[model samples]
Target: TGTLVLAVFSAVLGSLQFGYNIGVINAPQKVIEQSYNETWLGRQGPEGPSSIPPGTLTTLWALSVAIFSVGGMISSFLIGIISQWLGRKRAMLVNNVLAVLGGSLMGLANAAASYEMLILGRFLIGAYSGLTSGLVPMYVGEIAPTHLRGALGTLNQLAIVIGILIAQVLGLESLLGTASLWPLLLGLTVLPALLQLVLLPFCPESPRYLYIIQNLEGPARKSLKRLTGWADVSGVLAELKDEKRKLERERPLSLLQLLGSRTHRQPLIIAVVLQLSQQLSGINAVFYYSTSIFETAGVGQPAYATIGAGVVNTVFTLVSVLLVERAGRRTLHLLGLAGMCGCAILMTVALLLLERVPAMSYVSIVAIFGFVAFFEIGPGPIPWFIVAELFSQGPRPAAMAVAGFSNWTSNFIIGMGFQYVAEAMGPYVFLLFAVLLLGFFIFTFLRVPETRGRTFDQISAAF
Candidate 1:
């Protein structure tokens, strides 16, 4: 239990940074924009382009926010290689460097008067996030007992929303969200990254990865003992050997090969769609753009309301952790997608009527809370772990890469395009999300298989 708890806690530090950076910029948008304006004026004042060009600050800030997706997109493809080469624990250890570097850049950005540093820092953090999104779950999946896998896997997501909630709370005006101290807020991610680095060396390498991939039986046996606290690991060792034997018939897959193989086509499609569904469902928009959304819906304290939504986000994710095994992944995902769809529809209606009926604003906030709660219930946690469940060792890294790619790509689209789309489409913006959620909902019902209560071999057989 000591090694298990320590390993999981250290590994999820990356998840904390992932969620922290995602929500950090949202609560302090005004302060950051002010900082940007001062930076630009200091550079071009007295002469060139007096104060940032009209609407330029929005473009700059949008880039700052959305470039995170770009980092995710670029780095996600490398997960297949990174996880394979570095192994799970080592891969996470290496990835923490990016977090530290990112924190350094963002923490120093305001001091140096450089928005570029902030954007670049966001990219580094995003890249760190992308890799962890895949690797953390992969590591956790390898180490957990099958009975506990669902709950432990959910911890990956729980750490993330807890990170988001922490950022949200700290982003309050009375806290570090001020312009002068916001960089320090960004810098705090370095702490978790460092903790993981310090603790990871003591944690055992995933015994599954060691035995199956490295073919090191002695080390694998030792790892299993340490992780399970059982000197007699023969039962699990037998299972690992059985899995490795099956894996021997076919080697690990490349991205292209995985895509083209008909053997895995069904689970692959399901896997990719689940990740796509998670991000494309507009959850990030709720986290990133919800404050502005609340403002538009006539809320007096949009920042405080956004924090309240974060509480719902964190609470529901915690709820899902408790429910994931009992309810199963498929049911929770369907419930999440369906509820999110319904809430989006309601949100659109409320937004459309807000001008005519002031009470509609209250409905809008409820919709935000409802949508977030539903998201955490299923879509948030399942996608992270199910891909691992659906694939064997031979192709899991590839599957994780492609699924992660789909997740971040869709996230990029929402991050970069949502604000502009909201401007162009008026109150109908959530209407579009409602429609997309409907499609994803049907996809989950039709194509997605239940990964809960099944082993990797059993899940792979389902396709």
Candidate 2:
């Protein structure tokens, strides 16, 4: 229990940097606007004056967020393999170094007014984010005791939301007028990655990884001992040895094997589907573009309004981190879906009536915040948790590869397309997500199993 607590503490602390990175972009709108004005707008394009039309702020933001996500997708595709080859700790270190380099470049680009350079820097940060996305929760889950797994694993989600809030608060501050300081916000993420890398070498590797990868009993036992602090480590060691041998007997799943075979078909399906649903639910569009969503609701002071959304997100995720264990996964998923549906309807009515009906916008903002709150409770945590739970020992790394890519791919779509969708849908966009929420709920009731306290092997049978 002591080791379990210590490991979770280490993992959660490590995960805070990932959260910080999420918020790093929040305060740099001045930088973003300056780029558009001095660079993006004034450039001489093939068609002459390159200035975007009035009210292109949403498009610019969507593109910037989506561009980072594209890099995230690329990183997601590779992270599992890298984790398998170098171990999760080392994989994170590699990605962290890349984050430092990337954040630095983005800072430079802000000063230089090179949109291209700026985007490339975002890509690097995205890559690092993607890696952590797959690695962090998994580390938390693997390291935690069964009773505490859900709460601790959720630290990853909590960290991310906190990061977003911190960023929003930074954005709301008055002194953030210096455009170049934006990059420094992002660059500061390097400190956490640096800490993770330094401490990672000293910490034990994942016990599961050691047993499965090393194919030897002695080192595997030592790892389990180091990680779990069992006075008699033999029971865990026996179970691990049996698991490794059984996995060795089964068809070893490589990345290509996963893509090519029917044996892994269910996991692949689940992984991709859950990820797609996560984005299609429209949460990122709510968090990342809160300012725009609020504006559409007829609220002024959108930056401050978005901070409210951040507060709601942070508070709700905190609640989830506290109550998820008692609530259990199935009930929580259903409850969250129902709440999201209700909020969506409220938002739709609010937006539709904002111009015509007096006193509608205030209610609408409340509804929007309600939707955000419910979403963080379930879909937000489920996608990452489900992906990690679905794969077997042999296929987990590859399975995560596919799922992580799916998550980032979905993020890119929603991030890039949400504004366009909002523009096109004209306050009806929440309706689309609302309908999808209903559909995803039904899908979960039918397919996704509750993983509250189940071990990885026990959970795999649901496939």
Candidate 3:
């Protein structure tokens, strides 16, 4: 228990940075854009913000925001190689170097009057997040006992939302969200990376990785003992050996092999679809434009309302952490998707009525809250850990890399396109997400299995 807690805590520090970098920019959006405007003016000789094209600043700001996802998309493909070569724990430790460097660049961006630095910073941190997204869940899934896996796996999402909530609160105008402090707000990601660097050494390498991947029995047993606190780890080691032998013909698959072969086709498809469902459910769209949605709803202090949504995100994910082991992944995922689809429709309706009657604005608020809540309950958190559950040792890393790429690429598409879609389609934008959510719900119902209390081999065999 002690070992499990320590391992989860260390791994999730990376997850926290994932959500922190994501949410930290939200509260300070206008301020950062303004900084870009100022920097642009300084770049143009003898001109000020008044002379810059409106689209120019908007384009630069969009690049700054969207490039993070681009970097994530690019690096996500490399996760399998990194984890296999360095081992999960050491890979995560190496990942922190990116975090610290990226965080420092962001911190110095405003002070140095350089938007380029800010853009590069966001990109590097996105790479940092991409690496961790795949690594942390894989690490946590391997370390956790079967009975406790769901609960422990949920910790990754729990840490993410907690980080988001913290960033939202700190980004408040009275806090680091102000013009002067926004850089520091962005830079605060380094602290968690530093904490992980200090704490990760205390945790053990995954026994499964040591034994199955590296073929090191002695170290694997040592790792299992540290994690399980049992004198004899032979039973667990034996199970691993049997699973390994069963797949001796398979070995660890390469990225091309994972996608091309019929042996892994079903699980890979499941992995990709699950990840697509998570991103395409429009949770990021809701968050990306939340403050605008609130402002349209006549909420004063829309930033605070965004914070409230962040709180809801954190709270319900905690509910999932508690209930995931009890109620199971498929149940929670289906429930979340159905509920969020309802909320999306509600939001669509409320937006349609917003101009007709002011009272409808409050309905929009309720829908936003409900939408975010339902998301955290299932769709927001499930995909990250569930992908790890879908595959066995042979293709797990490659499958994860593909899934992670799918997630980030979809995220980039939404982040880059949603604003234009919302502007052109208005309330109908959510209707589109509602349609996608319905499809996702159907997919989950027909395909995904209940993974609770199942070993890796047992779960993989179901596919």
Candidate 4:
């Protein structure tokens, strides 16, 4: 890559660490169980990893993955403060260091056979991911031109899916069987982070953040001129001053204050609805329990299913990139929900019918893949896009933080409760999302506006 190319790609590259971290847990489960047994901190294990009763191992597995969300939830709330102190660029550099340290802890956890170290490592990695979720996109969007913005923003998701795929590919192999190699997958992420930290200094500070946050008119204007290709710096400088004035007049609003104002109702409605719609689509179940889902359906190994899911996730994301502006936001939202409902319904039927005809298991796996593909096309990308698009520059950060927190909280709910839903409701788990998706589809189609060419002010006024 050339200089500018490297600068842009640098942001995307940093997210490889995020992708790697997500799937890294799968490969280390054996080592994880061993470490848990050797430590015996919480409760003693049944004898061997295989001999461990389903009840106990299930409980421990829950501890390994489920515990990360609590740390993630806390780290997400702290991001706004970190963003202010270090700026998005500098903050991400810190995230890299923490990630490396976390990976080291994971390695040490295996060697020491300490559950405490394992839990601590997971928390550290979760915190690193939480911080990355906010900062990476912040930098990517700020640097990209408006015409290319959506496509560039899509890179974050693509990178995430790619990292996920790589981990799955690594996990399916024999390398994961050894405890010593556990760190190689998780800790190896540090390579990319080191590159990101080194390259970050050369990149420009976000023109918007530079002007608005520091109020340094001269350099801010210069940065703005480059992004906008403005002929005269004075006109751009004047516009920046005008925006600053508007921001000054705007009351600092709490999350509720921002949602409560008549002018804000439109964005708030869109943000909440989009995120809720994301939950109802059942994407988190795919992320958290895809392996289990595949095994339940009598598919190939969980590792194979993971890699397949990653491929489908990436492919449909590319499809989303191609179709978003064409189908329009509202149309894509409705279509995606409809598609997910259809897939989920089909999956439920297949699951039920599989008891009668074993071939239905294959049918159910295909349907599950379709469900993920449909989600990737719309629900996967739009929530973040709409949240960023909906808020005014002044309230954007806080609004995004609130929106992001909602997403993680919803993710936690889905991750924690899906198995219960599946157990209690049987295959009707799919039916729940089917009903929710149908309801949301109708609601969004009638209510959500097409944001294709509208300015932020114009979009807000629609409320």
The window of 10 residues in a row where model 2 has the poorest summed lDDT is 172-181
Which is superior by lDDT, 3 or 4? 3
Q: Count the backbone clashes (under 3 Å) in each candidate.
A: 0, 0, 0, 0
**lDDT score for candidate 2 against the true structure:** 0.72
Instruction: Note the residue pairs that clash in candidate 3.
Output: none
1 or 2, greater by TM-score? 1
Tens digit of lDDT per residue, candidate 1, span 212-271? 778889998888877788869899899989988998887888789989999988888888
Point to the candidate with the largest lDDT.
1
Which pairs clash inside model 2?
A: none
Stretch of 10 with least lDDT, candidate 1: 45-54
Tens digit of per-residue lDDT, candidate 4, span 9-104: 778877777777766665446555665654564344455344445555556666567556666777777887877776777787788889778768
- Candidate-wise lDDT, in order: 0.84, 0.72, 0.82, 0.72
Clashing pairs in 4: none
Question: Whole-model lDDT for model 1 versus the true structure?
Answer: 0.84
Error of 4 at 354 (Å): 2.4
Off by over 4 Å in 1: 145-147, 328-331, 384-393, 442-463
lDDT of 2 at 219: 67
